[PDB]
């Protein structure tokens, strides 16, 4: 998973 | 003259295992290296060592081509990279990204 969101 | 050298930042294709192994030994929080997503071709990561965690960010690319992470867009990743030298990373917390050691 990524701290920001992907979309 | 501004010497030309190129980036230690970019860190092409490496795991995101090894990115985290090499991150979680650098001395300072903001540590950090663009890397070459594995998970799907052309993306890029941005990998950020802060406290004993290091934190994953996905590089965005909008409909005219630009890089962002959260809201402002950037027309390189060499900008993008600078300007978070200066300003947050992190939502959370202030995390100031700084050149590796």
Redesign the interface.
């Known amino acids: ?4 969101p ?1 979309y | 003259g501004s010497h030309m050298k190129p980036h230690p930042w970019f860190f092409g294709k490496i795991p995101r295992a090894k990115a985290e192994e090499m991150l979680s030994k650098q001395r300072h929080d903001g540590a950090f290296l663009i890397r070459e997503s594995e998970s799907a071709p052309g993306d890029f ?1 941005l990998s950020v060592k802060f406290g004993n965690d290091v ?4 590089v ?1 690319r909008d409909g005219a081509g630009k890089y962002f ?2 809201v402002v867009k950037f027309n390189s990743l060499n900008e993008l990279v600078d300007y978070h030298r200066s300003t947050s990373v ?2 959370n917390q202030q995390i100031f990204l700084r050149d590796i050691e």
């Open positions: 998973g990524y701290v920001n992907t | 990561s934190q994953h960010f996905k965005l992470l959260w992190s939502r």
